[PDB]
DNA sequence: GTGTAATCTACTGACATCAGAGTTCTTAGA
DNA sequence: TCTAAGAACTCTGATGTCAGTAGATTACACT
């Protein structure tokens, strides 16, 4: 879908006693399972996408809250952006005492009707003003025949859920270990888009996974001036960009209210609230003072207008991988401007890969920025993993240093090791061989930070303290490697350290 | 379609479970 | 809307609308609440100009509160900074005695900001802010006159920034800037009049050109500026020698060539009738025997201001009052000539008074 | 490597 | 280093007169020393400069004589450069109507270095002679001078109006006498202290590269719990920023302390002004609501690294680490500790055992305590004088963005036809910079972009120059030689024009809009 | 004039980013 | 016998960017 549309998601639990207070074991509880799910996807969505909408609803309860079509349904929460007080409302109903806390309020086991329940949720999504990209309902019921004993009750539901799917709201399901069996082919076969224990999907809602997830958006758009005249529009996209702990919002102590930092400039002698025109900019050199205006400290540092000028072609081997400037950015075509320029770009991509070549360009991302120099290395897609595109096809902008960047480094000379000293090393190295994958690690600080933030925010008894994956697991490095550190200590240097 | 797309956070690709060094 | 529906009707309760506007403006952060709070002050001050209540408004507080905001003008959103200047320059209009020492530092502020905004190399102009300056300045000049007799440098600077706003040096795709420069020029051509005889053809060329643009408020702002331009230019030779026959020839030619022919709006055409009225007090100075013939030609033009050829619902709403608002000046200082024009004034009397219920 | 004028 | 420089400049009559295809040898030398003075006028080196003029119609020196030590002025003493020296060089200096001797000026200048080098500190020293060879002299003190140039430890650079691949017999014989003097000083390297005004104006074209070190950092490379090696890394690429910030100054007083920057605070309940030392507490944001931390309770719960660590996690092929993903602010070069000969053999073994397997290291790093822990790829390479193993940061799982860009081989709506392909086939060979004029299998490297100086700093110092010498005037255009350097023009543009001319027809070029500037209200 | 289009130009949320300022460490150090 | 000049890292604040929303300007048009 288009950029702005929120994900929006409504959670809809069976309040019926026959599941709600029920267990075959003692070790879980289907309502305590669903509520855990709702709290846990909801705490995922809080860290990861505060912009996307959640609601939660109980059907078949005995005391009601709805707009209309009231009987035996209670909207615990209408659609809203997610936060702490909502997670605190769900927390109240959890656990052995929780399954009594709920009973003092909304009441349990009464008759219900899916064609009314699906009506209610529909009205909910309608009532909200925002643009929605995905509209999804989640069923937390075990009741595999949903009391369609009256087939002329049940045909209402099936038609109404035809109407859900027809209006482009989706609906989705989880089965919840009903004693002895559950089978979708009896009923729910036509409500969703051979026999089950409990859903292999449901564990994915307990991943508790944390990052920002920020959708595909351009960094900027530019014109690749091949010369004085021929241009194509290309995008500039950010495939790799270091995340930061979110900017902290300064607060008033006594009320927790946000407060404005409200800075001014004031003359050291006098009451002049000096305006931006009152003051210049300056330097000191050679015991004299150089004076420039607030226009020209940024008229200096201009050279060009936003674009990409072509500078001719190179071998890919001469672009030496030791000197690297800043993270590489992707280039991909954009018919939003320069229509049909995709036809040129695609031929340019295809044929550079045959030539074993890069294009060299000069690059300005904005007006009032100096040109850097950038090699456009061409790119090719590994769809072989059943069209999981690990690599998009296009170009990489790889940046190149200038003289000033390549800092001087001290004198040293040696070519010291013998073939035995390499030969022992060639063993330890081959014993320590693993497979790195790009996603195999996580930031120890930024992951810890969210766990501290939750303890403070949901008022938890403890920080979760989940230990990081960057420390070497040194006992495994002792054992897999084995004792071979002694080959350095014996064969390579004296015993004095 | 389903195979790579997360149920917690749709359209976005499924976050695999952290890994680290293991031989 | 309700203050406009009702007007001045019952003044003795009105201060509480002011207190609501300054309280809203200070306590609400949203520009979309600051905008109506400013807008309602503009109309409130503008309608109570002649009132009993204009002292208890605390009009001298109101300058100090909204002038102080220019201390951090860079932080104020662009469209709110229109209205701060619309307001500030209006304080100089409505109650001059409380502005008497302040308005000179405000001239320094308005000129210094507008020079910076028109002539900066580092950025394209913030069109809303530029418009806010020309709008506020148009009230400022109503008192505190920078008329070319005194302060010749600042009065030249105001005039050649009005040329920078008025000239379509390149065409804009929105015209709030020309629209504001035109209202300024229309109310204050009296301030810059030696320059009106310096730049004279380029002024009437560009002013006439704006009259062709189909945008309606631009067109009304355009047209009302030519009337005042010719008004000031008339006063410039009501008390000057023969040197200006060359200039009078250009005016008595060109707009007459429009009146006697043009297929255009009642605004373009009824101005050129306003024009021909004004030049009597100039023209008597070279020859009394052209003063009668311009009255003869005003009434012998009325037969074709009539003859619009089925121009329903537009022509009488501005056409004939212009015939009468261009015919006193041809006799006011004279006593020479006998008059058919008096009996034929029945033609204008009955026409004019019959059309009183028609507008 | 160079020095003097070539500092 | 703290250096001595002594410009020893011939200002006799004759250098005013020339081969008509060039500027005079007088003004050529004056321009060279101008193009020099500018350099250390900006660069924050600790280097003292002196000026000596010879062929002067007067004389001013500590050593005055009747025939020797005469027609010489010691015009400026040995101190750090300044703008008034640059103005005097650019505008004050005159040819004398008389003539003088460079051996003459050299002895005075070298004796001035023997005075100045005692009472204040130095490391390296130079003397620099500029002339047309109109000096007439006896070949007197020369062996004692060459001996004394060793005993004083001063090198001589010599500057001339003509080539070393219409000149007078006097210039030919004078050069053989300069050769004989530098052969006597240094032998075969000695003639590389000799420079033409031609090649030097064609080399002094630009301001200096910004001089900065990478600071030392001592550490311990640790492949397993018991085995540590001493390591000390240096930054190698850093995206470099200017030393001095733009100071803020009052428009009429021009004093850098008449402005105080009040960062005042407001609660929105009609301008209740807070005190940061008592009443302001940072918060983070958590969904639809704010939660208060304390800056002093984040430090109680914050992830604290247990040490200033460097330690390898394991190894894996070059295949595991594709080009794109590299994510760093800087590159390290990660070296065996100074005078540790045990580390030297051990680390040379480490990286020589990576040169052959295509294996790479993966490493936890941390520069110092409290700073963030860090991960990534310690990537080896080889040069005949040392082993390379650079360290570079790689992404964590939340630094990496995955998007399915609509994939382009589905070409049925964006057709790459035979004639379009058969145009491009010639473009990308035709506009090659790298030309095969070699048998090393290294191409000419016709545009060595990593050897170019940053145009941002050339442009900055060029403005600071112009506004120093012309202190109330407007700013200049980009100096043209900067475009001539920053372009890639010469023969490549002569090759390109025809293959580009068939792109213009075989491919479409539908519109884009334009936007304006101060041109939106500027003259003519 | 009066009334209905079509369409330019704004403002905001959000995301990257240079600069600028606060903070701990090496060498040169009376 | 130690006191600043030079690094280094993080963090904060402004400027510019993109996508999307919607208002007011302003064109087009009536026989």
GROMACS .gro file of N, CA and C (backbone and C1' of nucleotides) in nm, chain E residues 121 215-216 239 241 245-246 261 285 295 338 368 370 401 456, chain F residues 14-16 18-29:
model
  150
 1007UNK      N    1   6.319   2.824   1.997
 1007UNK     CA    2   6.323   2.688   1.942
 1007UNK      C    3   6.285   2.653   1.797
 1101UNK      N    4   4.543   1.022   1.678
 1101UNK     CA    5   4.602   1.008   1.812
 1101UNK      C    6   4.635   0.861   1.842
 1102UNK      N    7   4.739   0.836   1.921
 1102UNK     CA    8   4.768   0.703   1.975
 1102UNK      C    9   4.659   0.655   2.072
 1125UNK      N   10   3.622   1.150   0.770
 1125UNK     CA   11   3.558   1.258   0.694
 1125UNK      C   12   3.588   1.391   0.763
 1127UNK      N   13   3.673   1.773   0.907
 1127UNK     CA   14   3.603   1.899   0.937
 1127UNK      C   15   3.704   2.008   0.976
 1131UNK      N   16   3.583   2.700   1.434
 1131UNK     CA   17   3.442   2.733   1.411
 1131UNK      C   18   3.423   2.882   1.382
 1132UNK      N   19   3.315   2.918   1.314
 1132UNK     CA   20   3.271   3.056   1.299
 1132UNK      C   21   3.224   3.115   1.432
 1147UNK      N   22   2.416   3.416   2.529
 1147UNK     CA   23   2.314   3.328   2.472
 1147UNK      C   24   2.229   3.266   2.582
 1171UNK      N   25   0.978   0.900   2.565
 1171UNK     CA   26   0.842   0.891   2.515
 1171UNK      C   27   0.809   0.747   2.481
 1181UNK      N   28   1.797   1.195   3.490
 1181UNK     CA   29   1.930   1.180   3.426
 1181UNK      C   30   2.026   1.095   3.513
 1224UNK      N   31   5.433  -0.054   1.954
 1224UNK     CA   32   5.568  -0.005   1.926
 1224UNK      C   33   5.673  -0.071   2.016
 1254UNK      N   34   3.681   0.338   2.469
 1254UNK     CA   35   3.704   0.373   2.609
 1254UNK      C   36   3.580   0.341   2.694
 1256UNK      N   37   3.246   0.392   2.935
 1256UNK     CA   38   3.117   0.462   2.914
 1256UNK      C   39   3.071   0.471   2.768
 1287UNK      N   40   1.794  -0.199   0.700
 1287UNK     CA   41   1.660  -0.178   0.644
 1287UNK      C   42   1.636  -0.272   0.527
 1342UNK      N   43   3.585   2.207  -0.063
 1342UNK     CA   44   3.529   2.285   0.050
 1342UNK      C   45   3.636   2.369   0.118
 1424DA       P   46   0.465   1.171   1.375
 1424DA     O5'   47   0.594   1.148   1.284
 1424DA     C5'   48   0.586   1.081   1.160
 1424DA     C4'   49   0.716   1.094   1.081
 1424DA     C3'   50   0.839   1.055   1.162
 1424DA     O3'   51   0.890   0.935   1.107
 1424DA     C1'   52   0.874   1.249   1.030
 1425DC       P   53   1.017   0.859   1.168
 1425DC     O5'   54   1.135   0.909   1.073
 1425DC     C5'   55   1.131   0.882   0.934
 1425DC     C4'   56   1.249   0.947   0.863
 1425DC     C3'   57   1.381   0.909   0.929
 1425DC     O3'   58   1.467   0.875   0.822
 1425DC     C1'   59   1.361   1.142   0.909
 1426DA       P   60   1.593   0.779   0.841
 1426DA     O5'   61   1.708   0.867   0.774
 1426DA     C5'   62   1.732   0.996   0.822
 1426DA     C4'   63   1.826   1.069   0.728
 1426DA     C3'   64   1.971   1.055   0.767
 1426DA     O3'   65   2.051   1.078   0.654
 1426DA     C1'   66   1.879   1.264   0.832
 1428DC       P   67   2.539   1.573   0.579
 1428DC     O5'   68   2.676   1.575   0.661
 1428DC     C5'   69   2.690   1.649   0.781
 1428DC     C4'   70   2.631   1.793   0.779
 1428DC     C3'   71   2.735   1.894   0.826
 1428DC     O3'   72   2.692   2.027   0.805
 1428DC     C1'   73   2.577   1.876   0.985
 1429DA       P   74   2.800   2.141   0.780
 1429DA     O5'   75   2.907   2.132   0.900
 1429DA     C5'   76   2.940   2.239   0.987
 1429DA     C4'   77   2.839   2.274   1.098
 1429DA     C3'   78   2.914   2.334   1.217
 1429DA     O3'   79   2.871   2.466   1.247
 1429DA     C1'   80   2.754   2.175   1.286
 1430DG       P   81   2.957   2.560   1.345
 1430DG     O5'   82   2.909   2.525   1.494
 1430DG     C5'   83   2.783   2.567   1.541
 1430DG     C4'   84   2.759   2.519   1.683
 1430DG     C3'   85   2.877   2.554   1.773
 1430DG     O3'   86   2.826   2.626   1.884
 1430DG     C1'   87   2.817   2.325   1.792
 1431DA       P   88   2.917   2.677   2.006
 1431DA     O5'   89   2.888   2.567   2.119
 1431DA     C5'   90   2.758   2.550   2.171
 1431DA     C4'   91   2.748   2.431   2.267
 1431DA     C3'   92   2.852   2.441   2.379
 1431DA     O3'   93   2.793   2.399   2.502
 1431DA     C1'   94   2.876   2.239   2.261
 1432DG       P   95   2.868   2.410   2.643
 1432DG     O5'   96   2.883   2.259   2.697
 1432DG     C5'   97   2.769   2.186   2.740
 1432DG     C4'   98   2.796   2.039   2.778
 1432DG     C3'   99   2.898   2.021   2.890
 1432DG     O3'  100   2.863   1.906   2.966
 1432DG     C1'  101   2.980   1.931   2.687
 1433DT       P  102   2.942   1.860   3.098
 1433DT     O5'  103   3.052   1.758   3.044
 1433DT     C5'  104   3.014   1.628   3.000
 1433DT     C4'  105   3.135   1.546   2.955
 1433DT     C3'  106   3.245   1.543   3.062
 1433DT     O3'  107   3.275   1.409   3.098
 1433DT     C1'  108   3.329   1.591   2.846
 1434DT       P  109   3.366   1.375   3.226
 1434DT     O5'  110   3.496   1.299   3.168
 1434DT     C5'  111   3.490   1.162   3.133
 1434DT     C4'  112   3.616   1.110   3.062
 1434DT     C3'  113   3.745   1.119   3.143
 1434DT     O3'  114   3.824   1.004   3.117
 1434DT     C1'  115   3.756   1.256   2.949
 1435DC       P  116   3.976   0.986   3.168
 1435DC     O5'  117   4.062   1.017   3.037
 1435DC     C5'  118   4.065   0.927   2.926
 1435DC     C4'  119   4.182   0.957   2.832
 1435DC     C3'  120   4.313   0.967   2.909
 1435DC     O3'  121   4.414   0.891   2.845
 1435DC     C1'  122   4.264   1.171   2.791
 1436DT       P  123   4.559   0.869   2.911
 1436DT     O5'  124   4.663   0.940   2.811
 1436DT     C5'  125   4.700   0.881   2.687
 1436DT     C4'  126   4.767   0.981   2.590
 1436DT     C3'  127   4.896   1.045   2.643
 1436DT     O3'  128   5.012   0.979   2.596
 1436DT     C1'  129   4.739   1.212   2.567
 1437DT       P  130   5.159   1.017   2.651
 1437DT     O5'  131   5.198   1.156   2.579
 1437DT     C5'  132   5.214   1.165   2.438
 1437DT     C4'  133   5.222   1.310   2.389
 1437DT     C3'  134   5.348   1.383   2.436
 1437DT     O3'  135   5.393   1.475   2.337
 1437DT     C1'  136   5.154   1.483   2.528
 1438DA       P  137   5.538   1.544   2.345
 1438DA     O5'  138   5.522   1.684   2.423
 1438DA     C5'  139   5.508   1.809   2.356
 1438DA     C4'  140   5.507   1.932   2.451
 1438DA     C3'  141   5.631   1.944   2.543
 1438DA     O3'  142   5.659   2.082   2.571
 1438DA     C1'  143   5.437   1.920   2.669
 1439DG       P  144   5.767   2.131   2.680
 1439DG     O5'  145   5.687   2.141   2.820
 1439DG     C5'  146   5.576   2.229   2.834
 1439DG     C4'  147   5.484   2.194   2.953
 1439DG     C3'  148   5.539   2.231   3.093
 1439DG     O3'  149   5.432   2.274   3.178
 1439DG     C1'  150   5.495   1.998   3.079
   0.00000   0.00000   0.00000
